[PDB]
Each structure stands twice: as structure tokens, then as C-alpha cells.
Design a protein around this ligand. Structure first.
Ligand code: 2ZI
Ligand code: ZN
Length: 208
């Protein structure tokens, strides 16, 4: 039931999504090992992901969380990078898209920094890189990220230098804690708490 609608580069929606992607690039402590060396992307396409069933599943859960949290879903728009991007847009998020080894337990991880999510496009630690060139810093192959609507509800704050949410909470917030430049990371434990709204196809660009 999923359809992908292309956004025109002239469309204001295209532009605000591209700005959030571009402006949330930062330097990483691995020096580019996992996600490659770049300061910006070449955006090739942005598509709206439309699936009535997944949307209703998301809104239903959103309403449950909101009613547990003084009518506040604490909804964010966050990046997600995964080798399973193609299953997620068709079937939604679930237990099979969890990161079992994650630092906040086995849940589904999301980032404010687009460049953090870029590190997982080819797998954990960037895996072995693009399938064509086996290169984690490939400047040629097309990459995809999701920009997702995520319900955090009451989020447990972890200061940091499928399982369950900590009791009384709906999510975990990974607060950046030595690297003063890093934005937060977030984890949910129910797939119904995210909807994959935009599919962004891009390349990382080699610095000149
Ligand atoms: C940790 C973390 C922080 C912020 C953003 C992300 C993010 O966007 N993706 C992943 C990610 C990790 C593993 C898998 C896999 F096991 F392959 F299914 C998929 C996605 N981790 C993140
Ligand atoms: Zn490649």
C-alpha cells in the first residue's frame, strides 16, 4: 500500500527538508570511517512516503502516548539510516529494525544529526561500504535516509559521554556529553511510534 510521491525542488516542503538534512551535518569522532568524509550532500530526490495503514497505526499510538503525557506526544522529526530502508517504507518500523547492540538497549535509533544517521546507511559502523565499490566513503553510489515523524512522549534522559522503555517513559534521549557539537539521539521501543515520512536519496560530496 505504499506510494512514493516525488517533491519538486521548487516546493517549499522539498526545501525545508533539504535544509534540515544539510544543516545538521557535523564532524564525527571516527574521522569519517563509518559514514565517509564530507561537509555536505548532493540531494538527488526527496519523496513523500504515503501509506494509510502505517499512518493510522502511528496516529493511534500517538494518541495513546499523548493521553499518558498530559496531551503531549512530544513529536519530533528525526533522521534514520538503515540497510532496511526499503522494508521500512513498505512494512513500517518493527522489532527487526532494532539495533540490538545500541548503547541504550535494543530499540530503534533516530538522530538529530543527518550525518549520524548517514553512518548506518550501509550497516552498523558503515558495514563494508557501498555494495558496488565496497567503500564507506563512496562519492558515487546513491544513498537513502528516512526523515521520520517520531513520538517520544515522556523521554528518559541519559547523559552519555527489542527491550522495553524504562518504566514510566516512552523513549530514551541520548544527550551528547563530551563532544559539545553533537546533537541528541533518540530511541523508541515500539515501531508504531515512528512514521517514515520522507525518503531522501543523496550522495555525500567530496570536500574541495
Ligand atoms: C545508534 C544510532 C544513533 C542515531 C541514529 C541511528 C540511525 O539512524 N540508525 C541506526 C541503526 C543501527 C543499526 C541498524 C541495524 F542493526 F542494522 F538494523 C539500523 C540502524 N543507529 C543509529
Ligand atoms: Zn560505491
Amino acid at each position: 500500500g505504499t506510494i512514493l510521491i516525488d517533491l519538486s525542488p521548487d516546493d517549499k516542503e522539498f526545501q525545508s527538508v533539504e535544509e534540515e538534512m544539510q544543516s545538521t551535518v557535523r564532524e564525527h569522532r571516527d574521522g569519517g570511517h563509518a559514514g565517509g568524509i564530507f561537509n555536505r550532500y548532493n540531494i538527488l530526490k526527496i519523496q513523500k512516503v504515503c501509506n494509510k495503514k502505517l499512518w493510522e497505526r502511528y496516529t493511534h499510538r500517538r494518541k495513546e502516548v499523548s493521553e499518558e503525557n498530559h496531551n503531549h506526544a512530544n513529536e519530533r522529526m528525526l533522521f534514520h539510516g538503515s540497510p532496511f530502508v526499503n522494508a521500512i517504507i513498505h512494512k513500517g518500523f518493527d522489532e527487526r529494525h532494532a539495533y540490538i547492540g545500541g548503547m541504550f538497549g535494543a530499540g530503534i535509533y533516530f538522530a538529530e544529526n543527518s550525518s549520524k544517521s548517514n553512518q548506518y546507511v550501509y550497516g552498523i559502523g558503515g558495514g563494508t561500504g557501498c555494495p558496488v565499490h565496497k567503500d564507506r566513503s563512496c562519492y558515487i553510489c546513491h544513498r537513502q535516509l528516512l526523515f521520520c515523524r517520531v513520538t517520544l512522549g515522556k523521554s528518559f534522559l541519559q547523559f552519555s559521554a527489542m527491550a522495553h522503555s524504562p518504566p514510566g517513559h516512552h523513549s530514551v534521549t541520548g544527550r551528547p556529553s563530551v563532544n559539545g557539537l553533537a546533537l541528541a539521539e533518540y530511541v523508541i521501543y515500539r515501531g508504531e511510534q515512528a512514521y517514515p515520512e520522507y525518503l531522501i536519496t543523496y550522495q555525500i560530496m567530496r570536500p574541495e
